Amino acid sequence: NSPSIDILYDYGPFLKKCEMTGGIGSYSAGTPTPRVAIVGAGISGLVAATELLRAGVKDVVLYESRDRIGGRVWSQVFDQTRPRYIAEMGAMRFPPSATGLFHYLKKFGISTSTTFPDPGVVDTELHYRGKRYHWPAGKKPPELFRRVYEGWQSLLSEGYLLEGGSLVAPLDITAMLKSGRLEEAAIAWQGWLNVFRDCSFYNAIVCIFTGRHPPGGDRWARPEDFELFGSLGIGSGGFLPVFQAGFTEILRMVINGYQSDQRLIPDGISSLAARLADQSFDGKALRDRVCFSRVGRISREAEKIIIQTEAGEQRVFDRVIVTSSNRAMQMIHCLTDSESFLSRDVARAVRETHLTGSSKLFILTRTKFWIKNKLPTTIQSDGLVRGVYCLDYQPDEPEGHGVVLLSYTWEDDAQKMLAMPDKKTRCQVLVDDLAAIHPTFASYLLPVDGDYERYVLHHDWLTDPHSAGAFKLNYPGEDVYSQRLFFQPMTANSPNKDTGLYLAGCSCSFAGGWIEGAVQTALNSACAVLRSTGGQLSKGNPLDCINASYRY
């Protein structure tokens, strides 16, 4: 099994046992079920609705502000004539340790067999200060980057020597988790938290690798080695722009195996949303319970919940699950004006939780030019482009079309794309930036038929008003917000704290920016709805079985 470190609990076993036996809970026969509203038809909203319907709730409606279901899962098609070629605007890489996510992938038969082309997994080039460095598939990175590669590796496997007592190897904390040693894992993790809770990624690695006991034996040169590490990353490409994030946010990804064995979904991750939506309950598809209307203010009148809709219409429900951004929760739903729905502590979590910026631009090329020619499959660059990924969506047809994620950027690197919103203009600027160092590669970056309107697709998540940010990533000192947001639906365990409204979505999880977070929070919030309204939960449920007590 694979319990996550912050909760010491795996959703996989529970979901397996419940698939068999009638869902996450039930009501006695003849019981009138609550009218439930779910704000948002992303993965979290669809999963929650799914398990609520499976548990016996007759009336659930999902509100959606976009013209499509799926939210930050968005496998956009260039050309519906040729739907296999897709641009994954949002979620893209999927770790098998995300057992909550993988429960539903396995269920709907959405293949995760193929590995994702991460740097170091396929032929990779790192572009750094004008030079091209080669990183052969399945090999150690080029020699320049070796000190920092090995230093990070040694940190994962060796831990870190502090004088007042050392810290357990992340890879050992991972072994503990897989082997059911949960008290042991908890103590080891608290150890890290105590030391690095108020330290950024950059700050932490400075202390670790320039101090008295650097893992790997070599003490990192500053700033040179930190620039190198920033370009090399830790499995997902250059992490320079997230150097300001809490070091604990990085560690938990590693320990939870989210930087490991990433898979690609050739069918597109949108097929998870399609299949969830295609489920039929009581003769009616989930998709048909989606109301395409933006929700505004959410208010409380006695023991009931009032949803304002964009029509001006106003509908009342018994319980509501909210999966929109914490930004939407503050500014649109107005959930932070008072103590009507959330405590002051949780309201602070909602108001102050950090969402990243992120942008992507894709191009559909005539050919998969990188295969038969001399070229890298992936390029990680200190230039504008940042992360380049070449994608093969039909490996058995080597002469099919190419999909190139020409630029994938985070935070500042993405905030840069904000001027030049014209995708033609952005594309050519990016190609020209890449061409400064690898003109041979850039020469193939032309859209099919020279049509930039059709065969270039881009998106900035930060300025998307349906998202207001790409994904949550806590700064140092802010992990407690994840705790508060994750355990918010556990108010259903305490009728005096239970306002009938529960927060959900990966932004309210311990895994911001991972569909796993959406799934876990969906399960917690769906369970809360059942318990709050007199239903009984299946044994092993998260509301009773998560008892982790960390201090952040």
Ligand X SMILES: NC(=O)Cc1c[nH]c2ccccc12
Residue ranges of the annotated binding site are 44, 64, 66, 72, 93
Query: From CA 223, how far away is CA 265, in angstroms rounded?
Result: 38
Is residue 41 involved in binding ligand FAD (CB under 6 A)? yes
Per the DSSP assignment, residues forming a β-bridge with 365 are: 402
Q: List binding-site positions for FMN.
A: 44, 64, 66, 72, 93
**Nearest approach, Cβ of 410 to ligand X (angstroms)?**
6
Q: List binding-site positions for substrate.
A: 93
Over the window 283 to 302, marking each residue x when it contacts ligand FAD by CB under 6 A and - when it does not, the resulting string is -----------xx-------
410 binds, among a copy of itself, ligand X, ligand FAD, none (CB under 5 to 8 A by kind): ligand X
Query: From CA 437, how far away is CA 384, in angstroms rounded?
Result: 12
Is residue 133 involved in binding a copy of itself (CB under 8 A)? no
Is residue 375 involved in binding a copy of itself (CB under 8 A)? no
DSSP tally for the chain: helices H, then strands E = 20, 21
Q: Where are the alpha helices (DSSP H) in 256-405?
A: 270-278, 326-331, 344-352, 369-372
48 binds, among a copy of itself, ligand X, ligand FAD, none (CB under 5 to 8 A by kind): none
Q: Find out whether 271 and 108 touch, Cβ atoms under 8 Å.
A: yes
64 binds, among a copy of itself, ligand X, ligand FAD, none (CB under 5 to 8 A by kind): ligand FAD
Q: DSSP string spanning 169-192?
A: -HHHHHHHHHHT-HHHHHHHHHHH
Is residue 461 involved in binding ligand FAD (CB under 6 A)? yes
Over the window 384 to 403, marking each residue x when it contacts a copy of itself by CB under 8 A and - when it does not, the resulting string is x-------------------
Is residue 102 involved in binding ligand FAD (CB under 6 A)? no
Over the window 209 to 228, marking each residue x when it contacts ligand FAD by CB under 6 A and - when it does not, the resulting string is --------------------
Query: From CA 407, how far away is CA 389, in angstroms rounded?
Result: 8
**Nearest approach, Cβ of 51 to a copy of itself (angstroms)?**
30
Peptide bond connecting 136 to the previous residue in cis, omega within 30 degrees of 0: no
468 binds, among ligand FAD, ligand X, a copy of itself, none (CB under 5 to 8 A by kind): a copy of itself
Pick from 3, 25, 40, 120 the residue near ligand FAD by CB under 6 A: 40
Is residue 429 involved in binding a copy of itself (CB under 8 A)? yes
Pick from 248, 358, 378, 532 the residue near ligand FAD by CB under 6 A: 358
533 binds, among ligand X, ligand FAD, a copy of itself, none (CB under 5 to 8 A by kind): none
Strands 290-291 and 60-63: parallel
Helix (H), strand (E) at residue 36: strand 36-39
Q: Find out whether 410 and 357 touch, Cβ atoms under 8 Å.
A: yes
**Nearest approach, Cβ of 98 to ligand X (angstroms)?**
9
Q: With 0-12 CB in 10 A as exposed, 13-18 as middle and 19+ as buried, what is 494?
A: exposed
Q: Taking the alpha carbons of 227, 232, 233, 236 in that order, is the dihedral positive or negative?
A: positive
Query: From CA 467, how far away is CA 12, in angstroms rounded?
Result: 28
Q: Which is nearer to ligand FAD, 360 or 438 (CB)?
A: 360
Q: With 0-12 CB in 10 A as exposed, 13-18 as middle and 19+ as buried, what is 200?
A: buried
Pick from 125, 382, 392, 516 the residue near a copy of itself by CB under 8 A: 382
Touching a copy of itself, residues 472-531 (CB under 8 A): 475-477, 480
412 binds, among a copy of itself, ligand FAD, ligand X, none (CB under 5 to 8 A by kind): a copy of itself
Beta strands in 303-345 (DSSP E): 304-309, 314-317, 319-322
List phi, psi (to 5°) of 361.
Answer: -135, 130
- Applying CB under 6 A, which residues contact ligand FAD? 39-45, 63-66, 71-73, 90-94, 294-295, 323-324, 328, 332, 358, 461, 466-467, 470-471, 505-506, 513-515, 517-518
